Design a protein around this ligand. Structure first.
Ligand SMILES: [Mg+2]
Ligand SMILES: [Zn+2]
Lengths: 552, 100, 1314
DNA sequence: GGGACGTACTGACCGCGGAAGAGATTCAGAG
RNA sequence: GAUGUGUGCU
DNA sequence: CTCTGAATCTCTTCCAGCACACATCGGTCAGTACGTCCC
């Protein structure tokens, strides 16, 4: 390696070769002068050690004499190890025509196209631009076209839009764990410096928008273009290779929008009226006369495959929600109406898509998922589902249950201090009564949350489901479960220890009120345990998957 | 420098179609070996492709056939590896046709 | 109280628990370490002399060449901090050590012939500690972290359920000295003691005890107990011990009660054990077989023939019975063994031991240490006496001795430094007693078994290593030294000490950069406790026990501050109120609690001492007497949070902030969020980035005041006074009367650091924050640095927030930003990039810096001067040549932009300086003249007033006095007297001071005007600083103070954002579908509190704009500052002023600052009360209106103020693409990294993805054409540029490289056939 | 006039881990 | 350029 | 007079991916020209 300014460094092998040549010359000289046998045997020992150090290192005496505490590199170290020649430059290579940036979300894009910055597109497709320019006669030599694209004329943008119009690309997230780790899309120019990506596709990559970075690759040959558009196209990957369950399941926001869209109340604007079709239903909603969700008699013109591909039209008059009729506008011909009569949670829309692809086909399923995405984000934006401190009501029976449990543990203490039971039995009784108190508090808070809302209906009052924001987020299955709500509103039960035992003193506090230092210091144990588990799980899984992919 | 870790008459020239002495720089010049210090004329990819050797005054054993657990030498001669370490590293003798 | 600087922004807070002890000096760890290290001390208990005395005075073999220590002296600071940091040279200092050299009379008593005492012989150059607590080496700033390791001493360990698939719980001990080799006493699955050197072959542990001059009978009595036997008349028999008899069976029958006792074969209960004393039976009768069923203890010798009767540790047999019967011995002594009380471990291990001689032990030890070596008597003796019986090659510290004595129930903490010949036996007996079932082992989790090594300790260790490695050459030179013909200057070499100290400070495992991008980062990077480095473990060998938290970390180590990743629990952070113990352990304060009175007297407890007392909790009310307001209180004895009686406690915590550190104490409402996101928030507060103009956080924690004071970027008033002159960079403060030194005096001057480069390419500056004609008290702030505001820590900005989805732009975690933010320029940051140049010397010709370079036009060569340097303040773009150099166009790298702000030139002798360097020298000289002249004038006015007042006596006028100059008064005479004598004395002092300042200015000019030293083989060094003005843009990363990260998705017009009924638009909108899942509920209360603060600020601003009277404003401020429950913040605005109230109200127009301590924050009721004080709704949720449709929503939405930040992950610093760039050399493959035109690495796991599909040509051209084919990719490019799309196969050159490497390895390999 | 070892200045030359697999190792059951 | 040193994101 | 089939000591290998910034790659004995303060 020639350093700057006359001087230069050297590799580790050169020292070994110099040592071997020097000792060989010294042995030749000692054979020339007929030295006594001890000297030539010492020289032979030195030469054997030098050859051993050149062929391998770290096996005889770890002799290096290269630098300060740094074992030099040999041919075994060239081939063996993590950074050996194989795993560094044979399997995982480094390829041009690539690039990386930070990803971001974009709602106005279909699931068969992705965003792309302009500078990246201008930098990657330079050969295609040169070819098209010198084909259209806008440049004589390659130097002319190179200087013109360096000057960044206006017409090169048109040339770029022409040459990229129908040229697919590839995307790639750094942790690749399965077949769907690398897919294909069609690029669309977007001003900026960040790659926009389809919302529903992000669920397959398992890549949140907390700053994750992806990579791009451009196929060159025509066969690769065909392989990308046919095999690795995002529209062809709708079912997981592991299980028959789909991969285009809506995750977080559109599910909340739909769940808020299809549910009836006790009294709304314009309840009891009639309507012809969903069109005038949406018209009434946009006019503001009728509320979003109310029981309205409407007529629908559904369809059904009577024969092997023969649709039959029919009419009906059902009692349904205005929002349900509005959602029916994007439903294709083949699906029945009884699929949208329920609350349409997460599993509901999952099986909806499952039955949609099972009957109609590919393109109807794709366009139906697209329309679901658009309308769900629209009505989720128009919903206005916020969160406040009043959204978490704490039942009044919690204090009394905690006082009863305290009386119980005090009585158990007073009984054990006289020697009636053993320590383990006392511990078991205490943990059992605290678990019972936890169950009681959980049932109390669930009863308080799920059905607190009572509203009159033309005089008399009546119970109904609740419209609490946190309850709508929990029940719809968007994020979290019942355990997290139990931890926020009620107590979080008991905690474990690094040993694995359970402390007899439970966490007698919620997250709405403050926590004393002791309970937080205890919960730190479980927090750090989970963090360490998540830290080491990837290090184990990498080697596991590597062995499994190497064995078969 | 003259033939050592790097050379031009043993491994190949530095720049394409240029001898070391500089007396010949031509694309037509092919295989014309010099006369002051005999060096042919070719490109540098042949310098990357060729290979040299080195000689020794005494034979030298190999370490992989020796130290590895399936010791091919040890399995061939049925002799413990420690005694072979002693012999190869000049610690004892081996009776080779010393009279049975 | 409430000084002028502490009065402009009176921060309201909610404090229930009253304060009892303020936060001490935050950097009292590293400064304390270095101070204790560097201070000389006649009592060599520590410091440098404690390291010198071990290596100093020495002696030769017999030549009487003894050099001896007398004293040393610290060298003067050669350079300053600023200029030396600009140069890039270590902030070191000389070390001149005085040494005395004597030579005794040749072969005689102590007759000193010559007593050479060389005056402070020179040696070494050690760096110094910066006032902030850093180092300066090569322009950067290292920070030596505190390494945590294991306490040197003794302990016990328990290998449980490890091997053999059984319940064997074999134990082992370990003696870890401060320096030397470890010693291990381990068991085996066959009940034998095994001793081991560090990690070498094991062997029976009796060998080391045999090697200590002992006899077998002494060895056996030293562990076991004898059994008494006696031949009264016949029928040998053993006496009765009541405790030995306990835990036995009736072999024949127990001889107690004379004749009738427990029947044949029983389990003797305690009743008969007490009967043993009730009938005091000692010795009656025992048969011979039960006696023969055991092993004799001592040896026996025949009385007639003088031969041996038997051997030690031998069981009894009929032949030995016959030999003892015929010999006739009464007193027989055997071993009382038991499977439950006295294990036969010692006797069995001695029996298995094959050797019996001590010389055999020496031979075995020497063979185990150095195999294949001739066993020599003297060599083995020296090795055994040098292994751990020597002072030089073995040294156990006094702390180690203390731990060793405390761990063995000793009393005296004194003793020797090496291991005695009794401690081994002591620890062996202790291990045997532990194996017997008494006591338990100690795991390595208790902080009493850990000790924090500091900077001074490592420095002393490295310096001692240097001394002991130069002592070899010292002895070698003195063995053949000369009589008197040379001084110790030629005897000693200063090379190795400097080499070792530079090796340790520059390139080590603990020395590293510091993050100047954030004062919080600077203060948290120093108070860091690592676990890596020498002596400690590594990043991947452990583990599962050393990563978790132990209940002793409470108050000592922060449980909730660590970088998430491959190192959890190893980079733990130190707490707030923690303090370094004298020994080196961790002390934490506690309040003394008497019977009923909680005295405010504080103490300090170690970790081992806490396990004895009981500690109360700060969450307990009291009233003027320390008595609790409860019947009983929650406490803990040993990790047992339970309920104890009220009149039993011993101590109570100081404050609730004791459990957390500064990295987490700056998070408001921490008591409501889980640690999984509190950790992320504490890291993101550390990874912040400053802005143009910082702003106070409306929701603070109170700690933000005592952070920037002790930080680096500030201006602490050294002495109070009055502001005289402050313009942009220099501050003149007139010194008060009582703060004046005797004799001469003056004023305090300050220089402010302007725009310069940090360690992470971030800007930094110091702006004044005071007005002219204003007093100041000593110990206040004068100039605010980056992300600071009037001595208050302020990281980022703050604005509105809304929790509602909007067209799905907030899909997973994205963040929406309105155009108002980028328009108002509130998140615009500054970046400074440094580019250097070299001018070396080649044999073809010296490298010139001429401004003429061919191949380019006049457009490129237009910004340069006559000397080839770009003009200062020239807008540069990508690819613009900045330095003209010939045998070389050092142009702007492709991607960066901005302007040029400064030029640096470093030259060496041989090449003259251009006009630029001379201009810089003249500017620096002009500044050094201006400041010295200002000082000269401001001090000379005093002497002129003195000579005026002296002239006033006798003869003086008034109007015709100020006309003749002040120097002409010295020219004026007066009648000869002591008055004129004082005039002449003052004139002499004037001339002396003038000449002294002239000499000082001459020296300062000579220091800078002279040449500069630099690296060899290079003449000129040109460093150019570039500055970039970049703002916020999509793709950037933002996060609040609760781990809620996100990437900016889209920037919308102002009107498209929602707005309330008053037309005020809405700022950044987050996603409300993250709170229930992440459980970071603490941010919503912060939002409500910020909304309340802004409402109060709006009321104040309205009442100020309508120009009301001061009484209404005072009344409203009294309304504001008097709400809530019992607090300590109780001010009275009716005492300050009429103008100060106006200034305070003008300062509060942006919003009333509200502080909140961590674990006793304001409750929800007080929040709603403060909301009701304003004009806001109770629930804090207001209707909105869409910018698109203009339609009201269907549910009130929560709004308020969050506290946004800005991180270093800028999108322009990650986006990188490349079509065709430079290639590698050994393998024809592309390069990687944003620099040097790198490309993405198509790794191995990605091949598996394509392998799952059916893509073949794709993978072929992926890893064949675009990667390795030197012949193929050229043809591919030529085909692509011609419209063709025909791929071509080829031969991977990396495969050829592998083939060549295998072939040169010595194995034939080659492609088979055609 | 003047000279020759400091003062650089190079030439070169030798120097806090499992888990498995495979080589030793020893114990006993007799013979 | 190769190694080493850390630091930061997944 | 000793063989072989199982229980133990002892030596060798590996541990996910990506990005960024620093240091170091001949030290020292043996020749080889300039040079300045007394001689
Ligand atoms: Mg992520
Ligand atoms: Zn030639």
């Amino acid at each position: 390696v020639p350093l700057d300014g006359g001087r230069f460094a050297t590799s580790d092998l050169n020292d070994l070769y110099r040592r071997v040549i020097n000792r060989n010359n010294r042995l030749k000289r000692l054979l020339d002068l007929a030295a006594p046998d001890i000297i030539v045997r010492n020289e032979k020992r030195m030469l054997q050690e030098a050859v051993d150090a050149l062929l391998d290192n770290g096996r005889r005496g770890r002799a290096i004499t290269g630098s300060n505490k740094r074992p030099l590199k040999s041919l075994a170290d060239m081939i063996k190890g993590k950074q050996g020649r194989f795993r560094q430059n044979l399997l995982g290579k480094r390829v041009d025509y690539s690039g990386r940036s930070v990803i971001t979300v974009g709602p106005y894009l279909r699931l068969h196209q992705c965003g792309l910055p302009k500078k990246m597109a201008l930098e990657l497709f330079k050969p295609f631009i040169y070819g098209k320019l010198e084909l259209r006669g806008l440049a004589t030599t390659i130097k002319a076209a190179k200087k013109m694209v360096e000057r960044e004329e206006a017409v090169v943008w048109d040339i770029l839009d022409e040459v990229i119009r129908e040229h697919p690309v590839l995307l790639n997230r750094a942790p690749t764990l399965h077949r769907l780790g690398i897919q294909a899309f069609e690029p669309v120019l977007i001003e900026g410096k960040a790659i926009q990506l389809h919302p529903l596709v992000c669920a397959a990559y398992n890549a949140d928008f907390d700053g994750d970075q992806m990579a791009v690759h451009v196929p060159l040959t025509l066969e690769a273009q065909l392989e990308a558009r046919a095999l690795m196209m995002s529209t062809n990957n709708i079912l997981s290779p592991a299980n028959g369950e789909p991969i285009i399941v809506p995750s977080q926001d559109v599910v909340l929008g739909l769940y808020y869209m299809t549910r009836d109340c006790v009294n709304a604007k314009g309840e009891g009226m009639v309507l012809t079709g969903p069109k005038e239903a949406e018209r009434l909603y946009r006019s503001g006369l009728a509320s979003l969700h109310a029981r309205v008699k409407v007529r629908i013109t559904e369809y059904e495959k009577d024969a092997n591909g023969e649709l039959v039209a029919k009419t009906s008059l059902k009692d349904t929600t205005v929002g349900r009729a509005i959602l029916w506008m994007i439903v294709p011909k083949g699906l029945p109406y009884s699929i949208v009569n329920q609350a349409l949670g997460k599993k509901a829309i999952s099986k909806m898509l499952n039955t949609c692809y099972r009957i109609l086909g590919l393109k109807p399923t794709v366009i139906f998922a697209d329309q679901i995405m658009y309308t769900g984000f629209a009505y989720a934006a128009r919903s206005g589902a916020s969160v406040g401190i009043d959204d978490m009501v704490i039942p009044e029976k919690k204090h009394e249950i905690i006082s009863e449990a305290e009386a119980e543990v005090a009585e158990i203490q007073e009984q054990f201090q006289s020697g009636l039971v053993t320590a383990g039995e006392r511990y078991n009784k205490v943990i059992d009564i605290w678990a019972a108190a936890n169950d009681r508090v959980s049932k109390a808070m669930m009863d308080n949350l799920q059905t607190e809302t009572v509203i009159n209906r033309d005089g008399q009052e009546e119970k109904q489901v609740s419209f609490n924001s946190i309850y709508m987020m929990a029940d719809s299955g968007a994020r979290g479960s019942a355990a997290q709500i139990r931890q926020l509103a009620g107590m979080r039960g008991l905690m474990a220890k690094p040993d694995g035992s359970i402390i007899e003193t439970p966490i007698t506090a919620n997250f709405r009120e403050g926590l004393n230092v002791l309970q937080y210091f205890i919960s730190t144990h479980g927090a750090r345990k989970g963090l360490a588990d998540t830290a080491l799980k990837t290090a184990n899984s990498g080697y596991l998957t590597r062995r499994l992919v190497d064995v078969a | 420098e003259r033939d050592g870790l790097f050379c031009a008459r043993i491994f190949g020239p530095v720049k394409d179609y240029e001898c070391l002495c500089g007396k010949y720089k031509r694309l037509k010049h092919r295989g014309v070996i010099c006369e002051k210090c005999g060096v042919e004329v070719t490109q540098t990819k042949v310098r990357r492709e060729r290979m040299g050797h080195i000689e020794l005054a005494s034979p030298t054993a190999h370490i992989w056939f020796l130290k590895s657990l399936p010791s091919r030498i040890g399995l061939l001669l049925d002799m413990p590896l420690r005694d072979i370490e002693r012999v190869l590293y000049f610690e004892s003798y081996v009776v080779i046709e010393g009279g049975m | 109280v409430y000084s002028y600087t502490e009065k402009k922004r009176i921060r309201k807070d909610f404090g229930k628990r009253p304060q009892v002890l303020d936060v001490p000096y935050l950097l009292s760890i590293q400064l304390d370490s270095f101070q204790k290290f560097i201070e000389q001390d006649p009592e060599g208990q520590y410091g440098l002399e404690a390291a010198f005395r071990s290596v100093f005075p020495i002696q030769s073999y017999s030549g009487n060449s003894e050099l001896q220590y007398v004293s040393y002296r610290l060298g003067e600071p050669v350079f300053d901090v600023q200029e030396c940091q600009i140069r890039g040279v270590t902030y070191s200092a000389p070390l001149r050590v005085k040494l005395r050299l004597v030579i005794y009379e040749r072969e005689a008593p102590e007759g000193t012939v010559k007593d050479i005492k060389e005056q402070e012989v020179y040696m070494g150059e050690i760096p110094l500690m910066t006032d902030n607590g850093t180092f300066v080496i090569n322009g950067t700033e290292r920070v030596i972290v505190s390494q945590l390791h294991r306490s040197p001493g003794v302990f016990f360990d328990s290998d449980k359920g490890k091997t053999h698939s059984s319940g064997k719980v074999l134990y082992n001990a370990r003696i870890i000295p401060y320096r030397g080799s470890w010693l291990d006493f381990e068991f085996d699955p066959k009940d034998n003691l095994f001793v081991r050197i560090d990690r070498r072959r094991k062997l029976p542990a009796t060998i080391i005890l045999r090697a200590l001059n002992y006899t077998t009978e002494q060895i056996l009595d030293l562990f076991f107990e004898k059994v008494i036997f006696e031949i009264r008349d016949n029928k040998l028999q053993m006496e009765l011990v009541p405790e030995r008899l306990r835990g036995e069976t009736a072999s024949f029958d127990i001889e107690a009660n004379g004749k009738v006792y427990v029947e044949k074969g029983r389990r003797i209960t305690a009743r008969h054990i007490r009967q043993l004393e009730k009938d005091d039976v000692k010795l009656i009768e025992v048969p011979v077989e039960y006696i023969a069923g055991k092993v004799v203890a001592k040896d026996y010798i025949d009385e007639s023939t003088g031969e041996l009767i038997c051997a030690a540790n031998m069981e009894l047999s009929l032949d030995l019975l016959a030999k003892l019967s015929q010999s006739g011995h009464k007193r027989i002594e055997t071993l009382f063994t038991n499977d439950l009380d006295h294990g036969p471990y010692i006797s069995e291990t001695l029996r298995v031991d094959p050797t019996n001689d001590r010389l055999s032990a020496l031979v075995e030890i020497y063979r185990m240490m150095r195999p294949g070596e001739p066993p020599t008597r003297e060599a083995a003796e020296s090795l055994f006496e040098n292994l751990f019986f020597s002072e030089d090659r073995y040294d156990l510290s006094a702390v180690g001795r203390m731990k060793f004595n405390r761990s063995l129930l000793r009393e005296e903490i004194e003793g020797s430094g090496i291991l005695s010949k009794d401690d081994i036996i002591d620890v062996m007996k202790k291990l045997i007693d532990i194996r017997n079932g008494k006591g338990e082992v100690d795991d390595i989790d208790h902080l009493g078994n850990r000790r924090i090594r500091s900077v001074g300790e490592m420095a002393e260790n490295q310096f001692r290593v240097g001394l002991v490695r130069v002592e070899r050459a010292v002895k070698e030179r003195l063995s053949l030294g000369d009589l008197d013909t040379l001084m110790p200057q030629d005897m000693i070499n200063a090379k190795p000490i400097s080499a070792a100290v530079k090796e340790f400070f520059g390139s080590s495992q603990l020395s590293q950069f510091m993050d100047q991008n954030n004062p919080l980062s600077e203060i948290t990077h120093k108070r860091r406790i690592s676990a890596l480095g020498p002596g400690g473990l590594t990043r991947e060998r452990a583990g599962f026990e050393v990563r978790d938290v132990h209940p002793t970390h409470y108050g000592r180590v922060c449980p909730i501050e660590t970088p998430e990743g491959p190192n959890i629990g190893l980079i733990n952070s130190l707490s707030v109120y923690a303090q370094t113990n004298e020994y080196g352990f961790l002390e934490t304060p506690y309040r003394k609690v008497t019977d009923g009175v909680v005295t405010d007297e504080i103490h300090y407890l170690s970790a081992i001492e806490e396990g004895n007392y009981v500690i109360a909790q700060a969450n307990s009310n009291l009233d003027e007497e320390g008595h609790f307001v409860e019947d009983l209180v929650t406490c803990r004895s040993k990790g047992e949070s339970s309920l104890f009686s009220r009149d039993q406690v011993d101590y109570m915590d100081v404050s609730t902030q004791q459990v957390v550190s500064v990295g987490a104490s700056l998070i408001p409402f921490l008591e409501h969020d889980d640690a999984n996101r509190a950790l992320m928030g504490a890291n993101m507060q550390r990874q912040a980035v400053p802005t143009l103009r910082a702003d106070k956080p409306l929701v603070g924690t109170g700690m933000e005041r005592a952070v920037a004071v002790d930080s680096g970027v500030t201006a602490v008033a050294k002495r109070g006074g009055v502001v005289q002159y402050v313009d942009a960079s220099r501050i003149v403060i007139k010194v008060n009367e009582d703060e004046m030194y005797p004799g001469e005096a003056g004023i305090d001057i300050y220089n402010l650091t302007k725009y310069t480069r940090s360690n992470q390419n971030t800007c930094i500056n110091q702006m004044p924050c005071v007005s002219l004609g204003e007093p100041v008290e000593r110990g206040d702030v004068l100039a605010d640095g980056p992300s600071t505001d009037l001595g208050e820590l302020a990281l980022g900005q703050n604005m509105r927030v809304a929790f509602m989805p909007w067209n799905g732009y907030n899909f997973e975690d994205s963040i929406l930003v309105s155009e108002r933010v980028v328009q108002e320029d509130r998140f615009t940051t500054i970046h400074i990039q440094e580019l250097a140049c070299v001018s070396r010397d080649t044999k073809l010709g010296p490298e010139e810096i001429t401004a003429d370079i061919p191949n380019v036009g006049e457009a490129a060569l237009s910004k340069l001067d006559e000397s080839g340097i770009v003009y200062i303040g020239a807008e540069v773009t990508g690819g613009d040549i900045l330095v003209g150099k010939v045998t070389s166009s050092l142009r702007v790298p492709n991607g960066v932009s901005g302007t040029v702000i400064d030029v640096q030139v470093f030259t060496r002798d041989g090449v003259e300086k251009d006009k630029r360097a001379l201009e810089i020298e003249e500017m620096q000289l002009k500044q050094a003249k201006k400041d010295l002249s200002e000082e000269l004038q401001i001090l000379e006015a005093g002497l002129f007033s003195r000579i005026r007042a002296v002239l006033v006596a006798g003869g003086v006028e008034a109007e015709k006095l100020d006309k003749l100059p002040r120097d002409r008064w010295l020219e004026l005479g007066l009648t000869d007297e002591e008055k004129q004598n004082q005039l002449e004395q003052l004139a002499e002092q004037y001339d002396e001071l003038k000449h002294e300042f002239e000499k000082k200015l001459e020296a300062k000019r000579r220091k800078i005007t002279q040449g500069d030293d630099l690296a060899p083989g290079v003449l000129k060094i040109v460093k150019v600083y570039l500055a970039v003005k970049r703002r916020i843009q999509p793709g950037d990363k933002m996060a609040g103070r609760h781990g809620n990260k996100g990437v900016i998705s889209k920037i919308n017009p102002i009107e498209d954002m929602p707005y309330d009924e008053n037309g005020t638009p809405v700022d950044i909108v987050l996603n409300p579908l993250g709170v229930p899942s992440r459980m970071n509920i603490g941010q919503i209360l912060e939002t409500h509190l910020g909304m309340a603060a802004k409402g109060i600020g709006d009321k104040i601003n309205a009442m100020l704009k309508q120009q009301q009277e001061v009484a209404k404003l005072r009344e409203f401020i009294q309304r504001a500052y008097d709400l809530g429950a019992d607090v300590r913040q109780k001010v009275d605005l009716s005492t300050f002023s009429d103008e100060e109230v106006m200034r305070l109200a003008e300062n509060l127009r942006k919003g009333m600052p509200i502080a909140t301590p961590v674990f006793d924050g304001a409750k929800e009721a007080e929040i709603k009360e403060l909301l009701k004080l304003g004009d806001l709704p109770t629930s804090g949720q207001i209707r909105l209106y869409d910018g698109r449709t203009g339609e009201q929503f269907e549910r009130p939405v929560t709004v308020g103020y969050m506290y946004m930040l800005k991180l270093n992950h800028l999108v322009d610093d990650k986006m990188h693409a490349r079509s065709t760039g430079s290639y590698s050399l050994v393998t024809q493959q592309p390069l990687g990294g944003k620099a040097q035109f790198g490309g993405q690495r198509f790794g191995e796991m990605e091949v598996w993805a394509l392998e799952a599909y059916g893509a073949a040509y794709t993978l072929q051209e992926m890893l064949t054409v675009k990667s390795d084919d030197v012949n193929g990719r050229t043809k591919m490019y030529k085909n692509i540029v011609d419209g063709n799309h025909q791929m071509e196969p080829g031969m991977p050159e990396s495969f050829n490289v592998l083939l060549k490497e295998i072939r040169s390895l010595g194995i034939n390999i080659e492609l088979e056939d055609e």
